[PDB]
């Protein structure tokens, strides 16, 4: 669990936002990009496993699941490329949930910034530093250098 | 332009 | 110093590789992009930022530490903006280093993918996971767990 | 294209 991350894709302003989430903490990160493709998406998962340590991903669909590219990518950072089946019914209300808050913040800040790509990692930033007490951030840290002790 | 992406 | 990072840019195959070093750890993270400029480096802040706890961060020369655009990313991000100026006179040795290390391992899998960026994240991937030990991307965490402790 | 980032 300090390494398991699920994928998400979320549709805004007729693009697309990729969102990576670990799951025991909420901590996410994402990015925005024309259309979700399995080349987008091997790339994104190849940053994040350079970043975290990675141990499985949820895909988010069954496209990006059967994908060779994503599994090339997956294979390449070691990762375990599993399904995203809610076998947890809570897990569909969760990641809704988060992305209703998500797109909420990217509105409030959306004038703020010429770019979508800048209004969406506006709200990674204010999502991740957000006590509700820890933040995800601090959440994150605290579970993986628990598990590394 | 007055953005914090592009402040012209 | 679980918060201070440092900025650092170098040129492969006519495109520039901006790096943030989190100087503790030698943990990196790194994009490519085809000229650095204020609003890329600020970009580049900003997601850094929403994704660990960036205190301070030493900028990579006087045009980004001048830059109203990187300034207003410092300021929305909460990042205290400094020179990076090698005070400390093994700075210069070890970031050019970094810089050569980065390149060679860019060279070792540049064969294994379409684009020069996803070379470069195989690169940032192969580094935080080196062990010399520990990686820097375990000592990254064990640092600011240990400061949030 | 046999590519890890585009295994086409
Ligand atoms: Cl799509
Ligand atoms: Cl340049």
Redesign the interface.
């Known amino acids: 669990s300090p390494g398991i991350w699920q994928l998400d894709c979320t549709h805004l302003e007729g693009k697309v936002i990729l969102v990576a989430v670990h799951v025991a903490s909420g901590y996410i990160?994402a990015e925005v990009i024309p259309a979700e493709t399995?080349?987008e998406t091997?790339?994104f998962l190849?940053?994040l496993?350079?970043?975290?340590?990675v141990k499985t991903v949820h895909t988010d669909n069954g496209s990006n699941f059967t994908s060779?590219?994503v599994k090339?990518?997956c294979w390449?950072?070691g990762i375990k490329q599993e399904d995203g089946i809610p076998y947890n019914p809570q897990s569909q209300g969760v990641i809704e949930s988060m992305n209703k808050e998500l797109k909420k913040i990217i509105g409030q800040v959306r004038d703020?910034?010429?770019?979508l790509?800048?209004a969406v990692?506006?709200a990674?930033?204010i999502h991740?530093?957000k006590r509700k007490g820890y933040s995800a951030?601090?959440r994150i840290?605290?579970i993986?250098?628990?598990d590394?002790? | 332009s007055l953005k914090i992406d592009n402040e012209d």
Request: hydrophobic share 40%.
């Open positions: 990160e399995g080349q091997a790339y190849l940053k496993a350079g970043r975290w340590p060779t590219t090339a990518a390449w950072a703020q910034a010429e770019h790509k800048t990692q506006m990674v930033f991740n530093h951030g601090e840290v605290d993986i250098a628990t590394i002790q």
